[PDB]
Symmetry: D3
Amino acid sequence: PIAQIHILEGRSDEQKETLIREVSEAISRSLDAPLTSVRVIITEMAKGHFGIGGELASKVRR
Amino acid sequence: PIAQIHILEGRSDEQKETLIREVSEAISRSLDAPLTSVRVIITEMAKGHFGIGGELASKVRR
Amino acid sequence: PIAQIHILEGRSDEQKETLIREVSEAISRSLDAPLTSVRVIITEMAKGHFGIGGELASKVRR
Amino acid sequence: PIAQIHILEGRSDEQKETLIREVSEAISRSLDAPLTSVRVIITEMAKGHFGIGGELASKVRR
Amino acid sequence: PIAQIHILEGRSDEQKETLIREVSEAISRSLDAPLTSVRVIITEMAKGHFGIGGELASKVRR
Amino acid sequence: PIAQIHILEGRSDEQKETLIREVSEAISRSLDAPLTSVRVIITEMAKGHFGIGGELASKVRR
Ligand SMILES: */C(C)=C/C(=O)C(=O)O
Ligand SMILES: */C(C)=C/C(=O)C(=O)O
Ligand SMILES: */C(C)=C/C(=O)C(=O)O
Ligand SMILES: */C(C)=C/C(=O)C(=O)O
Ligand SMILES: */C(C)=C/C(=O)C(=O)O
Ligand SMILES: */C(C)=C/C(=O)C(=O)O
């Protein structure tokens, strides 16, 4: 399984590391797949490249 | 956060349901984000549409 | 420019056709790009393959 | 609905903002979905990371 | 490396098989990476889900 | 056809150029499509944004 996760910029490397570890275990337990076959890609979005309801995330999020 | 997960076809709806629930919480706890902002997309691949090392998964996986 | 749009299953072919036409023009006008260079991909998700807040869309949307 | 748009680097923040706003309204009108549920991700590509017909966009585009 | 390839529906399984094999080797030779670490995902688009220049591919391609 | 390739950061521009050229020809020969219609997007991943088996690629790859 491959997971690509888009998140707004801002998190710490520690949080991203945890994210990768947690999501990998979640996928592994859920599908009963070896943890070693799980790949996770984190794609960070700049506040000016994400829109919700038509507005920029920078005008509406931290 | 938005997560797209590519998995091989075959799992039950129960397993996918669990996948969606488990990955959502993992993301939520990890980034300390409200569980309600987390979206998860499961994309299923046909065994003849996934290749590892140049070989089809149908030739090399269950 | 290339746009991939993930939407829940259910729309008519007419609506999707309109989606493709309307998003293409929006991109074209917005970036001042020739309408002919714009590609649009519509990816439909099964209600059991999309989750919002940990819950399936089939349990939480029409 | 979620839209991911890949575009070559170069546009202004104003153009990207418009893109996000225009595409969101286009998706909303087309599908008759609340504008507030539409998310748009803009992924910018470096001229050296996009190829058309085998050539780099930097050799063949502004 | 992971490659996702979007192609119009219609090809035979033989052609897709070749696609997967040929792109895997191309990536392997190009990046000087072990062929065994290369994953390829083929995503097929329905003619009514792909638009070029605002028009559906079913209206404009075989 | 459109190809998006995720690779770890580190390659040279020459290698990426080759990758784009090789993959484009591979897709073109395989599908018997005009080379001019093939688009290739290279998305580079930071060693800290890719996980394999739950670990960061930075702890386990060059
Ligand atoms: C998930 C994409 C698993 C995989 O690729 C493998 O089985 O090696
Ligand atoms: C993750 C994509 C979160 C989000 O969209 C939000 O904060 O509403
Ligand atoms: C958007 C992806 C435009 C493009 O590919 C072109 O300029 O041909
Ligand atoms: C489009 C992806 C809409 C959506 O997620 C929602 O209904 O909240
Ligand atoms: C490409 C995504 C290669 C990879 O995952 C690996 O080195 O195992
Ligand atoms: C592959 C996506 C080919 C294409 O878009 C075209 O036929 O112009």
